[PDB]
Amino acid sequence: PKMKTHKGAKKRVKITASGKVVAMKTGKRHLNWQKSGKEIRQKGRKFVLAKPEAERIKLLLPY
Amino acid sequence: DLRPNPGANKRRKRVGRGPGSGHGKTATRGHKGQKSRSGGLKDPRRFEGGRSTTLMRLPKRGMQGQVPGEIKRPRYQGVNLKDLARFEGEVTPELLVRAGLLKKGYRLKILGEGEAKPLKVVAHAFSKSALEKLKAAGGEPVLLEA
Amino acid sequence: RVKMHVKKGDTVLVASGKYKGRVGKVKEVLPKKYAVIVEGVNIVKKAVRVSPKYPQGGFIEKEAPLHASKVRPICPACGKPTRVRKKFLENGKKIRVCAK
Amino acid sequence: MYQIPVLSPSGRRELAADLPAEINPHLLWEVVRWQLAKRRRGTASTKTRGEVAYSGRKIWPQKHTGRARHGDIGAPIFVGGGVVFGPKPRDYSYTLPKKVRKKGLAMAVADRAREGKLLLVEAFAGVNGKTKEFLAWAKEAGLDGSESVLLVTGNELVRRAARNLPWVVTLAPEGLNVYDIVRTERLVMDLDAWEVFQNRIG
RNA sequence: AGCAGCGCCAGAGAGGGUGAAAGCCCCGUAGGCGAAAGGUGGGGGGAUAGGUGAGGGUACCCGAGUACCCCGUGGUUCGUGGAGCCAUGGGGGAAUCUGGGCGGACCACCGCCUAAGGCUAAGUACUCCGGGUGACCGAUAGCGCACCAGUACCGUGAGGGAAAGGUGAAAAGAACCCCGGGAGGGGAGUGAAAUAGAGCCUGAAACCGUGGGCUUACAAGCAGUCACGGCCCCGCAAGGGGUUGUGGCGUGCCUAUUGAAGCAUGAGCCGGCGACUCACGGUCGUGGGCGAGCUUAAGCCGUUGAGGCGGAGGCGUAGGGAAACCGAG
RNA sequence: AACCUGGGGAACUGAAACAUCUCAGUACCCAGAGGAGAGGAAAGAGAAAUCGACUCCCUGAGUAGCGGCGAGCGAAAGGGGA
């Protein structure tokens, strides 16, 4: 009763005013070494998911 | 008007869907018929596959929390002056929450766009935008103090 | 307690059933079952002798226990309900306007 | 609407009413359903296959026995053993928007108005709590017993009177509800009782 | 007690019984009275126990193997984490207010507080117990137990654990006769009813029988089904039913499966019991109410099926950003 | 009967394995208490030069936070009331 906001979720995703789940890009923090500047930049972005994106919004809501 | 015929105004019919019958939702009863259909399965909400949800997306929301937690800090409340210019007079935080925009955020921050009023709007924080439009209207006092 | 009922051994009318109108002197109230007996109900007990002692037991058709809600008492009239007034001393029953 | 009959010694006068114009079927029903379920008492009770007074032992082996396959004599497939999804004491009530009970109370009261089955009274010459008194009174006011009536006054003496009558339901001015305005065919109440309903919405 | 004629009480027309269906017959109901005795009781009164003052000087006092530190620990939202605090197994070990603790490692300032003694009503939980009520059960239900049940019975033992309620308004429970050793029937009789006759109201299905109509002993079958004929049957008539001789056609049910009549699964038969519910929170949809607003939670008052007050809070109006911040950016 | 405080204290189970974790200080064992029990006159709370014993309900709030940051776990002041 009274579902718990999946904590491991919110700690890595934010939901936007519109309602689309923005997520942090993966693949930068370890694989690195000399990844072309063009690499570690295009990775510094955030972005959108899709169908799992809708699974996400299911895990929060009180938030 | 009497008690015969109030009747849920033709559109709310509690018609549940009991699926134990001979025709309709039947036998397997509801969308079943396969297997792994007992007391339910693992999610599907977030979890599953058995691989890795998509918990591959990584934490960035650092400053997520020490062990004490949340710090005693003011919490300025944004509220568009266009939403203020409705009623008139000498508007203050008090007169503001006394309406329906605030809910005790103490700090208020009149700002935004539209048409300010030639009134006095006491507040806890303005915007360089609201400030000037408002100077082109009436007066405006800063915050009290702490 | 409160098993106390309409009346005792005396003159009581019957607005019951098959004996509607029959009025007799009631000779036994049995509070254990809420039934009295007058001269009315008289079913014929074909049985020989109720208890082995004695020769034959007679076809005695004697009174049969009637339900008390089917019996109204009566005095200088024709049977009323029973209100109860009180003296300077003890207390007995007065019917709808009469006495005794 | 605006035409509500008023009964007085000065004769027959009228008041002006600010009751609602158009009536909402459903809305008046939702209000009743609420009223009819907040008073509902969650009581029906059944025992699961654990609350059941049975013991647990595995009745018999499950293997090489030849016989069906059973755990405890509690299993709901068994007889006497716990019901499956048995009704458990609950609260059949919900919080109906106050903005709605009003719009209901206001529509029923405004209904009898539009049906001429309302009557505002002052002169309760049928005083001192004696139904006899009340019945020689209702007469003068019209009430003959043909129509079921809702009586709503703050006058105990007045209440006690018609209180036991079968064609009337007594009531305090406060009690007025969107159900007992739709039970009676009429509705009679103190010029002070309508002065206290119109105090809530008027 | 119904139907009807004419009446009547109601602070009582809740409910229940009376041979059926009663405001009026009964018991009650609404209203109002009542304790020698035991019990209860600051709700009221009374009394006591115990409590109440300033300034100044003095430097006495103010809970000890305790504080506090360390090692091993628990509790807490805190899983050794930057790990405080309360609690303490092990070791060391103060101070009497120019004192000691706490304010999340620690230090400084500034604030909170008086450990290491103890007691305290109320709100709170509970339901063996008594009372009230039910969009609770109605004898395979409801407690296991409506009943002589925690019994019978099973187990050494702990323990487990049944079944089983019904005549009738009243026993008026069938005198006597008849057959029979009895059981049991047949008449007579009781009763409105006895096919309400005693495990007896209702009496279903399986299942067992007796009488009748149709039908079968050269006929091959998932048993049925089309077609016609004979027979028997209700009907003026046309027609309808029951049966079934002949011809045509015809691979049971569920399940499980690529695939079943299948030599795969399950079921002897009938009756009863038997499986997608509920709470809270979501997300759609939908019917409504209100709308830059919508809405109370607990309770307080009222009601004894009567609702109302209660904005604490909640969701909404501004987003971005890890944050500081900024802001229709 | 149940409820209560303290002394002890499970595993299945969930983590779709499984050790930390969970189930849980639940089950049960024990001792003690009473119509209740416990709790209680701040070495308090924590950021208002401010609240002010305790108990409970509502809320705060699935928030702060805890967590092989997995499964999951989950407060406090403050506000409303008794």
Paired sense of beta strands D168-169 and D149-152, if any? parallel
CB contact under 8 A, D26 and B8: yes
Experiment type: X-ray
Tokens of C98: 């009469």
The CA–C1' separation of B76 and E328, in angstroms, is: 17
Structure tokens, C65: 């226990």
Q: How far apart are CA D85 and CA D169, in angstroms?
A: 40
**CA–CA separation, A13 and A55 (whole Å):** 12
Give CA–CA dist A9/B110, Å, rounded. 34
Least CB-CB distance to B55: which of A8, A10, A29?
A8
The residue that minimises its CA distance to C1' of E301 is D174
Q: Which nucleotide is nearest to A61 (CA to C1')?
A: E282
This PDB structure is determined at a resolution in Å of: 3.8
Contact B58 A52 (CB under 8 A): no
Query: Residues near D35 by Cβ (< 8 Å), separated by ≥ 6?
Result: D177, D178, D179
The DSSP string of B53-81 is -STTS-----S---SS-S------EEEEH
Q: Which of A6, A24, A29 sits opposite B57 (nearest CB)?
A: A24
Name the β-bridge partners of A46. A24
Nearest residue to D110 via CA among D196, D26, D193, D28: D28
Rounded distance between C-alpha atoms, residue B93 and residue B79, angstroms = 11
